[PDB]
Amino acid sequence: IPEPKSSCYNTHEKRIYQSNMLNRYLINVTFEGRDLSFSEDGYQMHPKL
Amino acid sequence: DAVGVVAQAVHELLEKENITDPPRGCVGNTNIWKTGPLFKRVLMSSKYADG
Amino acid sequence: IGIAVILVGTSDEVAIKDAHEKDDFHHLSVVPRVELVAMNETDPKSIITRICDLMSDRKIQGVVFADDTDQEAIAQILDFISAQTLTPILGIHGGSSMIMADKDESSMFFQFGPSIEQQASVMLNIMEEYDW
Amino acid sequence: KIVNIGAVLSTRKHEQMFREAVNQANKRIQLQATSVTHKPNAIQMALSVCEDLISSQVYAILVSHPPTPNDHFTPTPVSYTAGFYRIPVLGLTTRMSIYSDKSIHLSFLRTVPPYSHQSSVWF
Numbered sequence: 001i002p003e004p005k006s007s008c009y010n011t012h013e014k015r016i017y018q019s020n021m022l023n024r025y026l027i028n029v030t031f032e033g034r035d036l037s038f039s040e041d042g043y044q045m046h047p048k049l
Numbered sequence: 050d051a052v053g054v055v056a057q058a059v060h061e062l063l064e065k066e067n068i069t070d071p072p073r074g075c076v077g078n079t080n081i082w083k084t085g086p087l088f089k090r091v092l093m094s095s096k097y098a099d100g
Numbered sequence: 101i102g103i104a105v106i107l108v109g110t111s112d113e114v115a116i117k118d119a120h121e122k123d124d125f126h127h128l129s130v131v132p133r134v135e136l137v138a139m140n141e142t143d144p145k146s147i148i149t150r151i152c153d154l155m156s157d158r159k160i161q162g163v164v165f166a167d168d169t170d171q172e173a174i175a176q177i178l179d180f181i182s183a184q185t186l187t188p189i190l191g192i193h194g195g196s197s198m199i200m201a202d203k204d205e206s207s208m209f210f211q212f213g214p215s216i217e218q219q220a221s222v223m224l225n226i227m228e229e230y231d232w
Numbered sequence: 233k234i235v236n237i238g239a240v241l242s243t244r245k246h247e248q249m250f251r252e253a254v255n256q257a258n259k260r261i262q263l264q265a266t267s268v269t270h271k272p273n274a275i276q277m278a279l280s281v282c283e284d285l286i287s288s289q290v291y292a293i294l295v296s297h298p299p300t301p302n303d304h305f306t307p308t309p310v311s312y313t314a315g316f317y318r319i320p321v322l323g324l325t326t327r328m329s330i331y332s333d334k335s336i337h338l339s340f341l342r343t344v345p346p347y348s349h350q351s352s353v354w355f
């Protein structure tokens with residue numbers, strides 16, 4: 001699991017790490033019974049209106 | 050060119066000049082300055098022909 | 101990991117009472133350590149100041165946030181913020197989320213609300229089921 | 233009540249260019265001229281634009297680009313800040329089309345037509 005960035009601005013001089021594929025999975029997560037699969041393009045799926 | 054635009058904008062700003070300030074300072078004045086969009090319409094409506 | 105619920109100048113001490121919940125399951129949940137730092141109705145500069153300071157205060161590996169404001173800009177501000185350290189952000193109580201069309205290339209941010217296509221879809225369903 | 237304005241470049245002599253500008257301005261109250269800097273890791277760039285221009289009474293800001301060929305989002309970190317409170321600003325160098333929308337940015341006012349429009353010349 002990754003680690004917190006040392007700085008919001010100064011870590012940039014040393015921000016040398018892997019490429020995070022978070023959304024490749026983070027979009028797709030659901031628990032507590034209610035399903036919350038997300039969308040790639042940046043919003044929800046099955047929104048309650 | 051751009052400073053000529055802002056020049057043409059300024060002496061037209063006196064026609065309304067109800068801005069009373071562009072809010073400065075960091076904290077506290079969290080409100081959209083009530084003439085931002087209007088002054089922007091003014092500035093983008095600046096007509097000169099020599100730059 | 102470090103998670104916080106920042107509060108921008110509201111009468112929502114309901115949040116102060118909120119986070120007392122229970123869904124402990126056999127998942128990773130390695131370090132769920134919530135944080136509740138409210139603020140006054142402040143400016144984006146101080147907003148980001150506290151944002152990445154508190155991010156750097158104890159720990160941060162994922163952020164949530166809500167506020168009470170009109171639909172103006174706070175989401176866009178947070179959106180840029182999301183980029184500069186590769187971190188997820190989930191705006192909620194969408195006075196802080198009137199969704200934006202475009203997104204930066206590699207920003208892990210998301211927000212709630214409907215996609216405009218979905219609004220079209222629902223309004224068409226309404227138009228449908230009453231036969232005009 | 234004299235208007236104040238800040239720009240970003242290394243030809244800081246453009247400040248004297250702004251003095252000639254107010255000359256030709258009153259010729260065509262007064263207008264003052266201010267200036268700011270640039271730094272990498274544009275996080276603090278927002279901090280700097282705040283601390284250096286929101287300190288005074290801004291009315292419009294100027295930023296060209298860095299000739300460093302990154303040029304992808306180098307103008308953004310200020311298009312947002314004064315976008316809050318909606319203080320208009322002026323664009324100089326970059327020519328991508330993203331910065332044109334009225335819904336994502338209320339700040340850009342573009343001096344150089346962006347690559348999009350050049351389609352019509354083919355038509």
Ligand SMILES: *[C@@H]1O[C@H](CO)[C@@H](O[C@H]2O[C@H](CO)[C@@H](O)[C@H](O)[C@H]2NC(C)=O)[C@H](O)[C@H]1NC(C)=O
Nearest residue numbers: 023024025026027028029030031035036037038
């Ligand atoms: C998205 O996640 C779902 C599960 O949340 C994936 O679905 C499949 O695998 C699950 C593993 O337990 C099963 O429970 C699901 O039933 C199964 N889906 C179907 C239709 O049977 C799904 O593959 C994931 N997809 C992507 C693109 O990430």
